[PDB]
Design a binder for this molecule. Structure first.
Ligand SMILES: C/N=C(/NC)NC1CCN(c2cc(OC)cc(OC)c2)CC1
Ligand SMILES: CCc1ccc2[nH]c(-c3cnnn3C)nc2c1
Length: 105
């Protein structure tokens, strides 16, 4: 399970999931709702996958956790236009994440 040294990451993820702009990213991109996603995006990532990986010991370090957070945002900018609703949400969430992370790094 998660080492207590990563509790600060657990909190950041909780706060991201609560954010207004988090809705596109809470669960894996859903083929019932979005077509052609995995055709373009080789390594999907989302906050529920991160939450399970973190809580069950699948991140050894904060760097691995942060890499998955950035993957959420990098995938979003690969798939979505910047002026789309989901594209805008990804930019908001990247800023929010980086602001929280910078309190530690
Ligand atoms: C600004 N905050 C939120 N949520 C907290 N916005 C969302 C965004 C749009 N929306 C939505 C979008 C869909 O796309 C296929 C399908 C769908 O089926 C239920 C719902 C739900 C509301
Ligand atoms: C209402 C749930 C929902 C609907 C449509 C979505 N689209 C995306 C997304 C993420 N990254 N790219 N897209 C297009 N998440 C979504 C969540």
């Amino acid at each position: 399970s998660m080492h207590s040294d990563l509790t600060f990451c657990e909190i950041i993820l909780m706060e991201m999931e609560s954010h207004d702009a988090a809705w596109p990213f809470l669960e894996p991109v859903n083929p019932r709702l979005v077509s052609g996603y995995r055709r373009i995006i080789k390594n999907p990532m989302d906050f529920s996958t991160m939450r399970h990986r973190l809580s069950r010991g699948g991140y050894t370090s904060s760097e691995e956790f942060a890499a998955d957070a950035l993957l959420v945002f990098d995938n979003c900018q690969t798939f979505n236009e910047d002026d789309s609703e989901v594209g805008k949400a990804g930019h908001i969430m990247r800023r929010f994440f980086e602001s929280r992370w910078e309190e530690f790094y």
